[PDB]
Amino acid sequence: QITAEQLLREAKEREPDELKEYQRKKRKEFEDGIRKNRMQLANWIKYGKWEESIGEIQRARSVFERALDVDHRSISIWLQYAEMEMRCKQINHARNVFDRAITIMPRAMQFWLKYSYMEEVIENIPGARQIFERWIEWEPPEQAWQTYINFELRYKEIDRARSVYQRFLHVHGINVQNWIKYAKFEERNGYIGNARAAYEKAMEYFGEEDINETVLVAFALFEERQKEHERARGIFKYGLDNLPSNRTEEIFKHYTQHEKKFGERVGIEDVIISKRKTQYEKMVEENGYNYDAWFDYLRLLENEETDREEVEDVYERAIANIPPHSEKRYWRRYIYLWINYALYEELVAKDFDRARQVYKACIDIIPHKTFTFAKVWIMFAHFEIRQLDLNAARKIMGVAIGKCPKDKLFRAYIDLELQLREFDRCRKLYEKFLESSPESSQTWIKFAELETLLGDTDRSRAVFTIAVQQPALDMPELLWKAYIDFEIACEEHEKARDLYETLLQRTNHIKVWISMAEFEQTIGNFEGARKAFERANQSLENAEKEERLMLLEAWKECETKSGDQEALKRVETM
Amino acid sequence: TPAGSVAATPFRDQMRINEEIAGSALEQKASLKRALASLPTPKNDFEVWIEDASERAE
Amino acid sequence: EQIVKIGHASDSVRQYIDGTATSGLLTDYTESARANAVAARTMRTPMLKDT
Amino acid sequence: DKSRAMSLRYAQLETTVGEIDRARAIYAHAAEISDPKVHVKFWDTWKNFEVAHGNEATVRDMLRVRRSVEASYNVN
Numbered sequence: 001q002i003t004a005e006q007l008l009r010e011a012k013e014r015e016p017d018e019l020k021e022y023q024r025k026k027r028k029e030f031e032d033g034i035r036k037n038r039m040q041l042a043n044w045i046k047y048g049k050w051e052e053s054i055g056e057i058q059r060a061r062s063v064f065e066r067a068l069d070v071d072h073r074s075i076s077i078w079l080q081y082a083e084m085e086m087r088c089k090q091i092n093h094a095r096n097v098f099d100r101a102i103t104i105m106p107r108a109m110q111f112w113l114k115y116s117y118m119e120e121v122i123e124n125i126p127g128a129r130q131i132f133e134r135w136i137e138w139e140p141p142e143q144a145w146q147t148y149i150n151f152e153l154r155y156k157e158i159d160r161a162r163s164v165y166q167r168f169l170h171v172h173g174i175n176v177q178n179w180i181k182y183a184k185f186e187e188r189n190g191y192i193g194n195a196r197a198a199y200e201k202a203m204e205y206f207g208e209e210d211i212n213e214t215v216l217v218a219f220a221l222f223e224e225r226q227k228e229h230e231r232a233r234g235i236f237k238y239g240l241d242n243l244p245s246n247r248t249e250e251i252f253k254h255y256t257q258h259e260k261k262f263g264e265r266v267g268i269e270d271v272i273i274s275k276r277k278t279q280y281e282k283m284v285e286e287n288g289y290n291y292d293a294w295f296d297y298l299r300l301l302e303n304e305e306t307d308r309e310e311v312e313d314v315y316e317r318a319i320a321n322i323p324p325h326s327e328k329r330y331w332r333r334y335i336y337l338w339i340n341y342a343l344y345e346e347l348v349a350k351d352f353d354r355a356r357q358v359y360k361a362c363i364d365i366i367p368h369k370t371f372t373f374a375k376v377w378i379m380f381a382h383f384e385i386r387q388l389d390l391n392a393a394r395k396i397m398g399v400a401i402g403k404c405p406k407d408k409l410f411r412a413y414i415d416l417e418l419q420l421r422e423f424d425r426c427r428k429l430y431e432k433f434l435e436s437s438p439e440s441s442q443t444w445i446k447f448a449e450l451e452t453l454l455g456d457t458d459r460s461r462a463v464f465t466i467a468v469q470q471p472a473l474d475m476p477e478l479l480w481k482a483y484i485d486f487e488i489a490c491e492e493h494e495k496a497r498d499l500y501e502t503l504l505q506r507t508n509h510i511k512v513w514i515s516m517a518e519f520e521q522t523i524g525n526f527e528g529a530r531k532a533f534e535r536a537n538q539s540l541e542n543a544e545k546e547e548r549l550m551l552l553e554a555w556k557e558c559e560t561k562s563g564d565q566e567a568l569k570r571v572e573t574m
Numbered sequence: 575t576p577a578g579s580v581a582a583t584p585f586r587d588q589m590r591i592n593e594e595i596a597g598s599a600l601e602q603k604a605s606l607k608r609a610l611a612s613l614p615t616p617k618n619d620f621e622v623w624i625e626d627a628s629e630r631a632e
Numbered sequence: 633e634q635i636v637k638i639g640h641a642s643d644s645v646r647q648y649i650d651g652t653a654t655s656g657l658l659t660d661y662t663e664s665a666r667a668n669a670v671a672a673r674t675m676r677t678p679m680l681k682d683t
Numbered sequence: 684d685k686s687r688a689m690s691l692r693y694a695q696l697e698t699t700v701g702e703i704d705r706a707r708a709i710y711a712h713a714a715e716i717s718d719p720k721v722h723v724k725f726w727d728t729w730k731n732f733e734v735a736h737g738n739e740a741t742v743r744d745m746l747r748v749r750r751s752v753e754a755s756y757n758v759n
């Protein structure tokens with residue numbers, strides 16, 4: 001098809017008196033072109049260039065002098081006019097053109113660069129200096145001074161180049177980099193006494209308060225390069241004081257590199273820790289909600305063995321950042337910001353009366369009617385036990401259960417009273433625990449296990465019987481297992497049998513029927529298992545074939561292990 | 575689509591060992607209390623590397 | 633958060649009790665959870681009431 | 684090349700967790716920088732997803748983006 005490309009491609013593809021008389025035609029072409037357009041200056045340049053070539057250079061001057069009357073702020077024309085005079089070798093005319101150009105446009109850089117270069121290529125170099133001297137009178141900004149300096153360096157005048165810098169710093173010296181470049185110029189030539197003077201005068205120039213510390217680091221690193229290193233520490237160390245928060249971020253990165261050699265035992269660890277300390281404080285100023293920054297900060301200060309009052313001020317700053325959401329998913333990291341504080345007060349500061357206040361302040365801050373940290377109530381309880389104050393410890397756990405009855409609290413309180421050999425107090429707490437969480441069959445088992453460990457069988461039986469009477473349980477199977485296993489441990493098989501009887505009266509589930517048979521198999525009353533299997537298999541005629549099969553595989557296991565081939569025929573005809 | 579699969583992971587109601595009838599929470603609280611108040615109390619229970627950079631310097 | 637709480641509680645109980653001579657009365661709480669989870673995974677977007 | 688691979692990876696997580704509505708937007712967002720003329724393994728795995736976890740109203744949505752995206756490359 002012939003769409004865009006082929007149509008437009010096809011459209012695209014279609015696409016010496018005689019010399020004197022020719023020259024007259026060109027002049028008319030230029031002059032009439034000038035007449036109409038006037039601001040045409042590109043053609044005004046071409047007419048000037050064209051006349052030049054012919055040796056009509058005398059006329060070409062006339063063209064450019066007319067062209068300058070039209071624009072005069074003409075920097076293209078001025079360049080072309082001078083360059084025309086230079087190629088012609090007119091150099092006094094070329095000088096006159098530049099002397100006009102720089103007079104009329106003293107702040108067009110191009111003329112001073114071009115003019116100094118012309119005189120330099122002629123080896124006029126006294127005159128080339130005078131051009132740069134004349135230029136500097138205009139206070140031209142940076143690049144003019146750098147080009148004059150570089151000019152004197154190419155001659156290797158270096159003390160005259162130094163004079164230019166000293167004047168350059170007077171006009172420009174508000175900019176630090178001019179001082180640093182000056183000092184680097186003195187250093188590299190080897191004048192190093194001048195380089196010290198240059199930095200020290202730069203600091204005196206910028207002052208005491210508005211410390212230009214990029215000078216100070218530059219000064220420090222120069223002295224480091226000298227191997228003055230005592231001076232280099234001094235400069236860095238001096239800077240750290242007056243600079244302390246914001247600008248030290250630069251100082252510390254050089255100061256720590258400095259010490260990384262010479263610091264090695266005491267100097268490295270000091271600067272890195274103090275760097276880290278201010279670096280964590282930056283994170284805390286950005287976001288006091290950054291708990292991971294507080295934990296990492298507190299690690300540093302504890303390994304420092306920092307003075308106690310400073311670590312307390314840092315913990316209490318960290319702790320005041322209570323989560324804004326008031327939902328426990330956000331508190332899970334924040335709560336250890338209190339626990340670490342109590343561990344520090346107990347283990348390191350050893351001020352137990354102040355660790356009470358840490359826990360009271362902690363529990364007065366948790367939104368208990370919405371959620372609790374059982375860790376807090378547990379740790380606060382065990383702390384008073386280490387103070388031998390059971391009355392306080394019981395009050396703590398008591399209000400814990402009273403405000404927010406929670407499983408982790410009950411377990412901890414019960415385990416405490418068990419360790420205290422306060423078995424009758426454990427019992428009262430289990431009854432409260434069961435009232436809290438009645439469905440938790442594990443607690444009914446753990447309650448009966450307490451009674452079993454204390455040797456009161458009839459206590460344990462009454463718990464289990466009241467347990468299996470409950471309208472709901474998380475795992476009746478776990479409880480029925482536990483009570484069967486208990487009656488097996490009593491060897492009162494005639495009651496353990498009754499448990500399977502009542503359990504089977506609750507459900508005809510095949511696994512209960514199997515375990516009823518396996519119970520008789522483990523008594524060794526193997527006929528009871530067969531009578532159970534028959535009682536199951538003859539009654540479960542309406543059970544599923546796989547249910548009956550799983551039942552009858554258990555009997556086939558029974559008879560193949562006993563080896564009664566006559567019974568296996570009965571099994572084979574089940 | 576309801577994401578049934580993760581919700582399926584918490585297993586519950588393993589076996590029919592229950593009557594599926596329950597009392598109101600306050601009288602169920604009393605049911606435990608009035609039953610578990612029957613638990614006897616028959617007797618009391620008692621049942622009694624090298625420093626060497628640093629080593630030469632120091 | 634609720635799901636993983638219930639799951640970890642049930643599984644820990646399973647590991648404590650099981651491996652005893654009167655087991656098998658217990659319905660395999662961790663493995664039955666696995667069996668339930670793989671069965672439920674097949675599911676589809678329903679169409680639309682309006683169309 | 685890897686962003687498609689990561690899209691298959693991410694869809695496998697959302698489909699095992701059962702966030703099947705998110706899985707479609709993973710595939711559909713990957714389908715626009717895939718072509719059915721050489722990336723057939725991507726379209727097969729999305730097709731095997733949509734026949735399993737999808738239905739007529741979204742299977743046709745798959746076939747719409749398929750013919751749209753191939754048209755982007757098949758300028759001939």
Ligand SMILES: O=P(O)(O)O[C@H]1[C@H](OP(=O)(O)O)[C@@H](OP(=O)(O)O)[C@H](OP(=O)(O)O)[C@@H](OP(=O)(O)O)[C@H]1OP(=O)(O)O
Pocket residue numbers: 372373374375406407408409637641
């Ligand atoms: O409420 P519980 O069933 O008694 O579970 C608690 C509790 O978990 P919750 O978040 O559900 O309350 C603890 O959590 P906290 O209240 O202390 O935040 C938790 O402690 P961790 O959060 O420190 O894990 C503890 O687990 P562990 O004893 O391993 O610390 C766990 O107990 P379980 O192991 O009995 O579930």
